[PDB]
Each structure stands twice: as C-alpha cells, then as structure tokens.
Structure 1
C-alpha cells in the first residue's frame, strides 16, 4: 500500500501545484493520507514530488 505526507509548504508555488494538493486532499503539513494505486496516482505524485514524502 501507499502513504503520503507533505513536508514543504505551498504558497509561493504555481497554480499547477496548488491544485494537485486538491486532488491529494493535503491541507496542512503532516496531513498523512492513504489513497489507492494506479498509474494516475503516480503521475499525480511525480508532479509534486519535491514536497511530499512517500512512506513505503
């Protein structure tokens, strides 16, 4: 299974990386969330892959 946490903030970053966190539901630093797996979820994590930590 997967796991997602958000370690860097998102204020001074793009509106192409202020709407992926909508689709990941992350609203605060440390907001750990488990989701499904598919190629789409990896494609939606490799766009914001500088500010999450995957936990697996």
Structure 2
C-alpha cells in the first residue's frame, strides 16, 4: 500500500498493560525504534491507542 513510519519517542514504564500490549503489537522495542508498518485501519487504531507516546511519519 503506502506504509508509514512509527517511532516510539517516549518510554513505557508506568504505562498500562493494555498500552504495553499495543506497543508489542506495533513491534516497537525501545525509544526511537522507527519501525515501518503497512497503513491499514487496524494499524491506525493501534497508533491512535498510544498516540500520546508514538510519532507517525507519512
């Protein structure tokens, strides 16, 4: 499709287990990971869930 870049930016220590599971599903491991994921509504929902800490490039 078009794909998009997702960077973790902030840390996940005092975050909720659901948010940590969202990060795991997105595949982000540390700060500044900059992973690439296909742009689909499910990925958009995952991004929106933790938008307060992730940064999107497109």
Q: TM-score scaled to structure 2, two decimals?
A: 0.89
Aligned residues: 56
Supply the RMSD in Å over aligned alpha carbons. Answer: 0.8
- Cα deviation code 1:4-42 (max 9, x no counterpart): 001110010100101011111111100010011111110
Distance 1:38 1:4 in 2: 13
Structure 2 residue runs without a partner (length 5+): none
- SS of the equivalent of 1:20 reads helix
Structure whose residues are more often helix by fraction:
2
Residue aligned with 1:19, SS: helix
Q: Structure 1 length as normaliser, TM-score?
A: 0.92
Higher strand share: 2
Long gaps (5+) in structure 1: none
